Each structure stands twice: as structure tokens, then as C-alpha cells.
């Protein structure tokens, strides 16, 4: 129960690593790849109806952005909360499937769709689970679906590069940078944002939609693509990247303290190993197999609340 000692210097530069090598290049990757979805959109939608190998493509583009605002999720703070945006970008948990039935009444009332108008409609018919939605409801997109999926992909773009040039702008005010001195206020709310990635991702996407503790509520991440491991994986991999990095790990191994970062490192292996094992749609998977996934991220999240957090001599909520 020994908290290691973090000059406010070593906090200044690791919050300053965080904003530059993790926050801002999630952000920065995720409105690249809503960019490459709207461009081959547009190029596929000339030649509309779009099938075969195009809509294929557009399928594949679309997992690839989703996996990296997945991985842009581990911050649930900041420009991506304002004007709930993240909502606008993605709409989930949806336990009562609002997505679905709200897409193709859109489409049927706007064929000629554009995407500043989709600023007046609701978050529930656009962002990551609209396109999904639009890109997976038949094998052909006719030119009012088209429509749909460059003005959806488009109002995403925008909204992603608004909160990249936001961090870019405001990442010291926002993760308390030139106030370490004074207060814990940036590392408390960055690793409260890691363990809450990992608690919404167990409760959530994994133990409610599959039903592990009682009736099944909600629906897994990528339920309609059926691509949910695809979406885990991307979330336990940037989880990974954040707690195996080496400045981290520094700061943690001031002592015999550097048991902490060793003991976090295997368990996060352990469940990439064993999420690999299992189906591309982890609901396809044994029911023991998915309680095994549970127990593997519910004891990830007991290692940051009971070692990370008190090594750190941060607490757990914020």
C-alpha cells in the first residue's frame, strides 16, 4: 500500500507524452479513417447501385474507423463529451435498438441527404452504429443509401477533426499540465478515463448483452456487422499500449512497486490471448468462453483500482 513519489515535473512530462502520443493520434487516426470511408464512399456512389467488392470495401473501411474510435474512446472526458459529440459520433450502449428503425426512416424522408443537415437530426441515425446500420442492411446500396453513407461518414469527419484541433489547442488546460505543482488533477482523471474503458467495456458490451449475470440487455459492439471481438481487441490493445509504456513504467518502478506494471502487462496478454481464441462475433462463443473473457477484464479492472491506483497515489473515481 506504498505510493511512489511523482515529481511535478515527471507528471507535466508524461501528461504532455499522453496528449502527444496517445490522445491526439487516436483522434487524429480516427478522422483519417471516417476521411478514407467518405472518399471511397463518393468514388463507389457514381457508378450507384453499389455491391460486390465496392460495398465489400466500404464494409471493411468502416471496422477499420471503428476500431480506431474505439481505441480514441480510452479518454471519456474533454472535446469528445462537449455538445455530447461522442453520442453524434457513436450512439451506444442502444438497449432499445432506436439505430436500427431510425436509419431507414431517414433515408425514406431525405434521398438527397447532406451532411450539415444531419446536425439537425438525432445522434441515434448517424456516427459509427448509422453507417454500420446503412452499410450492412442489404448487399446493395441504391443512391438514396449512397447518400446516407457520404453525408453520415462526412458530419463524422467534421466532428472528429473538431475535437483533434481541440486537444491540439487546449490539451494543458484540459489535462491540468502547468498545474501539477498543486493538484493530481490530470493523472486522476486520465487513469479514471482508462479504468472506466475497461468497466463500461465488461459491464456494458460484454456482461449485460450476453446475459452472464442475468437477462440479456443491450447488444454487443459491431452486433449487426457481427464483428465484436474485432472492436474488444482495438480497446484491449490501446489499454495494453497505455499501461506496458515505458514512461509509465518508470514512474511505477521507482521501488518494488515494478511488481504492479509486470502483474498488469500478463494480464492484459492473458485476455488478448484468450479473446483471440474466440469467434469474429463473441456472441457466437461458448457460454463458459465468454465468462472466462468477464473474469479476465473484471480482474484487469481489480488490478488498476486495488495496485495502479494507490501505487500512483491517485483514487478510484473522479
Keep these: 500500500i506504498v505510493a511512489v513519489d511523482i515529481s511535478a515535473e515527471t507528471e507535466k512530462t508524461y501528461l504532455t507524452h499522453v496528449a502527444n ?4 493520434p487516436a483522434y487524429a487516426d480516427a478522422a483519417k479513417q471516417s476521411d478514407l470511408l ?31 474510435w474505439a481505441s480514441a474512446e480510452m479518454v471519456n472526458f474533454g472535446p469528445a463529451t462537449a455538445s455530447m459529440s461522442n453520442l ?3 450512439y451506444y450502449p442502444d438497449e432499445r435498438g432506436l439505430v436500427h428503425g431510425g436509419v431507414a426512416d431517414l433515408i425514406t424522408a431525405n434521398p438527397a441527404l447532406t451532411a450539415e443537415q444531419l446536425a439537425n437530426e438525432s445522434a441515434v441515425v448517424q456516427g459509427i452504429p448509422g453507417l454500420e446500420e446503412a452499410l450492412y442492411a442489404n448487399d446493395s446500396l441504391d443512391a438514396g443509401q449512397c447518400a446516407y453513407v457520404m453525408s453520415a461518414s462526412s458530419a463524422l469527419g467534421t466532428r472528429l477533426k473538431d475535437i483533434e484541433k481541440n486537444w491540439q489547442q487546449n490539451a494543458i488546460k484540459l489535462l491540468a499540465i502547468d498545474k501539477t505543482a498543486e493538484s493530481d488533477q490530470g493523472l486522476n482523471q486520465w487513469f479514471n478515463s482508462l479504468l472506466s474503458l475497461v468497466e463500461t467495456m465488461k459491464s456494458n ?10 437477462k440479456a440487455k443491450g447488444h454487443l459492439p459491431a452486433a449487426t456487422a457481427g464483428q465484436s471481438r474485432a472492436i474488444i ?28 506494471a509486470d502483474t498488469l502487462s500478463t494480464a492484459l496478454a492473458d485476455t488478448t ?9 463473441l456472441a457466437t462463443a461458448d457460454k463458459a468462453t465468454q465468462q472466462e473473457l468477464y473474469d479476465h477484464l473484471t480482474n484487469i479492472t ?12 491517485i483514487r478510484v473515481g473522479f
Design 205 to 214: 458490451a460484454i456482461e449485460q448483452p450476453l446475459g452472464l449475470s442475468g
Design 88 to 90: 453524434y459520433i457513436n
Design 21 to 24: 502520443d496517445m490522445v491526439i
Design 233 to 260: 481487441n482495438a480497446k484491449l490493445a490501446t489499454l495494453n499500449k497505455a499501461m506496458t509504456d515505458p514512461v509509465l513504467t518508470a514512474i511505477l518502478g521507482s521501488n518494488n512497486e515494478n511488481t504492479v
Design 38 to 68: 467518405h472518399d471511397l464512399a463518393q468514388k463507389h456512389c457514381q457508378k450507384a447501385p453499389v455491391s460486390g467488392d465496392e460495398l465489400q470495401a466500404l464494409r471493411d473501411q468502416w471496422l477499420v474507423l471503428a476500431q480506431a
Design 273 to 281: 490471448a484468450l479473446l483471440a481464441q474466440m469467434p469474429e462475433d
Design 302 to 313: 481489480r488490478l488498476i483500482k486495488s495496485q495502479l491506483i494507490p501505487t500512483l497515489g
